[PDB]
């Protein structure tokens, strides 16, 4: 989806 394309799992947070 279109909200912020993220490249790098380090920038990810669990759902919510």
């Amino acid at each position: 989806p279109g909200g912020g394309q993220i490249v790098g799992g380090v920038y990810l947070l669990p759902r919510r």
Epitope: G2, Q5, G9, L12
Partner: antibody, heavy 118, light 114 residues
Framework: QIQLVQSGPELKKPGETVKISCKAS????????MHWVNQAPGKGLNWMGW????????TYADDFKGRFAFSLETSASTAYLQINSLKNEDTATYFC???????????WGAGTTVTVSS | DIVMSQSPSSLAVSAGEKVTMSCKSS????????????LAWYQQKPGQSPKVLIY???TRESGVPDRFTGRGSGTDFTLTISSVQAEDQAVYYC?????????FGAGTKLELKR
């Protein structure tokens, strides 16, 4: 279902520049980052960088920083890769791939070979 | 730039046998909040483009043979093929996507024996 069609083999001479395409189909183009990976004859894969499809902003890897440019045409759901000042070393295949948030490529183009020779 | 070290550069097995290949990163690919390692495994056959087999280090991709298994957490990972077939001949590459730039390993070539 989802597809990425890439332009045909290219034959450029040293110095000239080339530009290739990658057309997405079956999904909302603007929702996924598009990446470029190259591979020289008899070698491994190299991440070249990526283009933010919703924004158009390109990020290049140290090695492909200089004469390489990622382009976009949202209306046509296509991504372009241009290599200026071609050198007898850029001879490679060049794939385009769609990236998911789970951090992996699930769709690739077949690759566009480019030969730099006189 | 995380470095990915694959070994061995080549493996020769006979159909039906089980093979395992390693891949190690210069640093942890684990995100302690999502608690997942962003290492993926791709299969590239001659004249083809790579295709994913595993992501999240140990999650098999939809539609991929169950004899393909990824293991590991942190910096040491492995890909296992339980019963190798003729159509598994190819070079396997691992890729980290924890921190850009995304980096690939050198790959391991799977050759059959008959």
């Amino acid at each position: 279902q989802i597809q990425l069609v890439q332009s045909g083999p290219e034959l450029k001479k040293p110095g000239e520049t080339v530009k290739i395409s990658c057309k997405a189909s079956g999904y909302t183009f603007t929702d996924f980052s598009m990446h470029w990976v190259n591979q020289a004859p008899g070698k491994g894969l190299n991440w070249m960088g990526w283009v933010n499809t919703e924004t158009g902003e390109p990020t290049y890897a140290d090695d492909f920083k200089g004469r390489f440019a990622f382009s976009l045409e949202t209306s046509a759901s296509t991504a372009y890769l241009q290599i200026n000042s071609l050198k007898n070393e850029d001879t490679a295949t060049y794939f385009c791939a769609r990236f998911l948030l789970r951090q992996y490529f699930d769709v690739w183009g077949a690759g566009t070979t480019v030969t730099v020779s006189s | 730039d995380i470095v990915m070290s694959q070994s061995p550069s080549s493996l020769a097995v006979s159909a039906g046998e089980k093979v395992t290949m390693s891949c190690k990163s210069s640093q942890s690919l684990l995100n302690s909040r999502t608690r997942k390692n962003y290492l993926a495994w791709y299969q590239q056959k001659p004249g083809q483009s790579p295709k994913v087999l595993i992501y999240w280090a140990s999650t098999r991709e939809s539609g991929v043979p169950d004899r393909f298994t990824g293991r590991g957490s942190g910096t040491d990972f492995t890909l296992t093929i339980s019963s190798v077939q003729a159509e598994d001949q190819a070079v396997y590459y691992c890729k980290q996507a924890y921190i850009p730039p995304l980096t690939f390993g050198a790959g391991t070539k799977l050759e059959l024996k008959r």
